[PDB]
Design a protein around this nucleic acid. Structure first.
Lengths: 35, 29, 150, 144, 129
RNA sequence: GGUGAAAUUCUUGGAUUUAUUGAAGACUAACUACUGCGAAAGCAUUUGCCAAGGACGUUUUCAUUAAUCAAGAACGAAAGUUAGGGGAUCGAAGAUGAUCAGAUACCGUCGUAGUCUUAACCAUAAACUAUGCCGACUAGGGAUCGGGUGGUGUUUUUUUAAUGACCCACUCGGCACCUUACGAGAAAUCAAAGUCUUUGGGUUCUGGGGGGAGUAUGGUCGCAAGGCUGAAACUUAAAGAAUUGACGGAAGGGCGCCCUUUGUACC
RNA sequence: GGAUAGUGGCCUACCAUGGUUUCAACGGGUAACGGGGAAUAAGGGUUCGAUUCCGGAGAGGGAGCCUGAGAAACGGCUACCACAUCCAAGGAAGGCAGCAGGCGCGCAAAUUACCCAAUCCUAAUUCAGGGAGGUAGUGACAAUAAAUAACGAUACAGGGUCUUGUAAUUGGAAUGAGUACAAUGUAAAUACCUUAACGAGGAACAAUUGGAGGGCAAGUCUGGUGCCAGCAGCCGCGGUAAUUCCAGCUCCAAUAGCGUAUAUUAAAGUUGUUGCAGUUAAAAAGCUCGUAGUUGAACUUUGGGCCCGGUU
């Protein structure tokens, strides 16, 4: 549940007043593959 | 709502309600 | 506050700021000391002698009129008792409450009070045997204390 | 005030009280009970070696599936049998039973990157070569 | 009981200075309390103290003048070598130029800077700034 | 009698009820308070006996004799254990009934141990102010309890003197309260929970995320019930103070639809 | 008194009944040789010290002993114990926790090399001997210094006649990584220092390792795949507890190094002496007395005058 966790927790920082990069098809995935 | 009664180890009455519903140790030289 | 209680009272006496010569006294020094030794020749303790000389003969306090303490005066004439006065009264009270406890066995508050009095007695006896007034052991105990007090 | 003795000659009380308090720590108690030598699966060691017992498909969920599985391995020096998270996919075609893998610890668990219920070991080497070079096609696994 | 009369005296001074009174009454007095207030007056942190002499222990009445942030005792009177007295000031003084920690040496009761000057150390008594 | 309803129950040898009298054991209503005492648990009729305490007053006495306290000791609500006594009430266990959708109205009657006391045990409670004990200073006010001081102040003598009671002012020591924030705190709130990042008056005890677990083992106390001391492996990222609302089948109004008030988890 | 090199319950005879302990004796654990020291830098502390020096103990476990000034020696002996070797079956020989090296145990650790030239030791002694030690080989333990490119011209883009950026554009310069006459170097060699000659036009002589919601720096990137009782109809869209299912492009950090595991330290004021907290968040014994422990009221030569000489 990477997408739901990131999309839920990037909105709380919007209430707290901090910059968040806008989402696209690059956020909720394995950016780096494992060994 | 009522505040729950707080303790570290569970009380003896609640222990009664939950429970109703040997060899020595070693000291190796 | 009190040693074995919850009270915090300050009911006591305040010695006046004068080390000499009440003006209206103008009587003597040796007449006072012979009154003291004669009152002790009845057999009274220093506190009762002090209160009688305050209540009857205009002696404000004996430390300033005679220049010497009452107990040291009685020690100078050899009228000093074998045990000091406060330990004697503590022993007498302990004896009386103990006799009550053989008579009334169930009185638990009197047991606690006896324990308090005996702790007081032990502390005072430790103080006296420290300063070499009693024999260096003096061994307060239950029975012979009666024979000790009277 | 402040609870503790503060007198100039009360160092003995301070030391003894501090000793009992430090016994109520966690790092200190783990160090002086010596459970790294008696109860830990590794013998207090960083890495270890083990012979692969078998492999079980502990899968995240059903048909829509994210395939992250683990092996069951037996230690050599101790004999205790543990579970190990193999790294990235396709390596279970590479490691089979009885291959004498070399194990380490896993690390952090957050929202992702492996939240497996009770697997703290990752297979660092297999058949005494690697997983990285054996996945990046640098070296090849020798037979037996 | 009154285990440290210097502590109670300095605490009374602190409370009455924080609440803004003009006079402070101190009981009981001592040689050490008198010397402590002479150190304060010679550095000017207080006003004018006069000692009422009854036969029991005396009392002190001190004129404050403002100008005093905080004074206190360090208890127990730690044995303080000279080679680490700077550690003590770096422990509890706001800056390196003002504020004084007070030492009782065999040369008397004296602030820290003349304890450097006389090259003598002793026990720590208190601080004032 | 009993319940929302019924039944078991007692009664024309008169139940229930009224009056006269007796017997038993237990408890002391109303007075009863934001009052008192006790180290705490706790303590409420009268009188007598025995001893004890606190506060106040003291131009009495000793001159540091003290504060806190592992070992050790005394007491310790209710419950519970062994003999004796007593057994009115209430009443674990137990016996019996209707079990009627719902008991939102899960009970009725009888009733052993107990409840009371003696001689012994046990030593725990939400044993709570959830606030160790001793000492210092810091703010306004009004009540109240105990003692003491002063009043060409009041009232009762049967002649107005003592005393008693009341009123005014002060003081010591208490139980409590209203406001405030000079200060503190995460907040509720606090004259202490203040004098603390400007951190040190003296000293005992206790705690180190949650489970496992007050478990297992050992020791010790106990006739028993049980008490005191008390881990680990393993596992997990979690587990106090306020305000704010969706939700309403909370209701009340209007003219199916709107408006006001309204309280916001365990099994 | 015996014995010892010598004091001494070190041992024996006789006679006393003592010695240690809450200031924690005695017992137990130590994955404990002790110290000089090491890591961590606000201070205080926490952790480590098998290891280059100093002191102790041991040569597979115990014991005994000969020689000698010195040994309870082990590259000396004797005996037992545990291993275990040679055979003619009668007998004999053994001690790598010295240097190399082998087996085993393991996450975990080098050459069965050269030499006494240096440092020093032993002897009858300048001469001999020394796996003590030095040299080299293996060696990304750790530590220091810094190559992988530099300068123009052209044509554009600029800041706009002085100053930067781009290009399948162009030019000559410079030199070490390597190959090596030689000489230094060395006990003799290898390597370093020096240098005749050769040695740069990029796939050349090509740098990796981690990452890219936030911590914490850098994507309003690309493509492919498995599924859908949802649209469309064979083109596809969207969603896909796919915890992205797989690959590529671009970017960031560090850089001859980078990541990971474990342990420990700091930021930590979660060990609190400096410096924690206990009404309600973990945490004030039910209450009182009381021994050791800790702590404990005030007071005793102050003040004034004299001189001299030291430092700014």
């Amino acid at each position: 549940s990477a997408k739901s966790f990131i999309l839920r927790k990037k909105e709380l920082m919007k209430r707290r007043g901090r910059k968040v990069a806008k989402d696209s098809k690059f956020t909720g995935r394995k950016r780096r593959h494992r060994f | 709502g009522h505040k729950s009664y707080k303790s570290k180890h569970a009380s003896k009455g609640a222990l009664k309600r939950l429970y109703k519903g040997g060899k020595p140790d070693k000291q190796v030289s | 506050g009190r040693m074995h209680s919850a009270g915090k009272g300050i009911s006591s006496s305040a010695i006046p700021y004068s080390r000499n010569a009440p003006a209206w006294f103008k009587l003597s020094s040796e007449s006072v000391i012979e009154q003291i030794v004669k009152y002790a020749r009845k057999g009274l303790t220093p506190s009762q002698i002090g209160v009688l000389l305050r209540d009857a003969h205009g002696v404000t306090q004996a430390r300033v009129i005679t220049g010497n303490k009452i107990m040291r005066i009685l020690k100078s004439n050899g009228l000093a008792p074998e045990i000091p006065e406060d330990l004697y009264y503590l022993i007498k009270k302990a004896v009386s409450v103990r006799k009550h406890l053989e008579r009334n066995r169930k009185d638990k508050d009197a047991k606690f009070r006896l324990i308090l009095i005996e702790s007081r007695i032990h502390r005072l006896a430790r103080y006296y045997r420290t300063v070499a007034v009693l024999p260096p052991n003096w061994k307060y105990e239950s029975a012979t204390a009666s024979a000790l007090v009277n | 005030g402040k609870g503790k003795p503060r007198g100039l000659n009360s160092a003995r009380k301070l030391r003894v009280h501090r000793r009992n308090n430090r016994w109520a720590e966690n790092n200190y108690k783990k160090r002086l009970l010596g459970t790294a030598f008696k109860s830990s699966p590794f013998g207090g060691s960083s890495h270890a070696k083990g012979i692969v017992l078998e492999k079980l498909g502990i899968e995240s969920k059903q048909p829509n599936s994210a395939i992250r599985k683990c092996v069951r391995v037996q230690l050599i020096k101790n004999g205790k049998k543990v579970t190990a998270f193999v790294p990235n996919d396709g390596c279970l075609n590479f490691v089979d039973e009885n291959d004498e893998v070399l194990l380490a610890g896993f690390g952090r668990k957050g929202k992702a990157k492996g939240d497996i219920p009770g697997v703290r070991f990752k297979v660092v080497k297999v058949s005494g070569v690697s997983l990285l070079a054996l996945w990046k096609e640098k070296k090849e696994k020798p037979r037996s | 009981t009154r285990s440290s009369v210097l502590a109670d005296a300095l605490n009374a001074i602190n409370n009455a200075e924080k609440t803004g009174k003009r006079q402070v009454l101190i009981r009981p007095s001592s040689k050490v309390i008198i010397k402590f207030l002479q150190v304060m007056q010679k550095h000017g942190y207080i006003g004018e103290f006069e000692y009422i002499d009854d036969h029991r222990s005396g009392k002190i009445v001190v004129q404050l003048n403002g100008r005093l942030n905080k004074c206190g005792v360090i208890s127990p009177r730690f044995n303080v070598k000279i080679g680490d007295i700077e550690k003590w000031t770096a422990n509890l003084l706001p800056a390196r130029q003002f504020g004084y920690v007070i030492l009782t040496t065999s040369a008397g009761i004296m602030d820290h800077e003349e304890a450097r000057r006389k090259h003598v150390s002793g026990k720590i008594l208190g601080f004032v700034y």
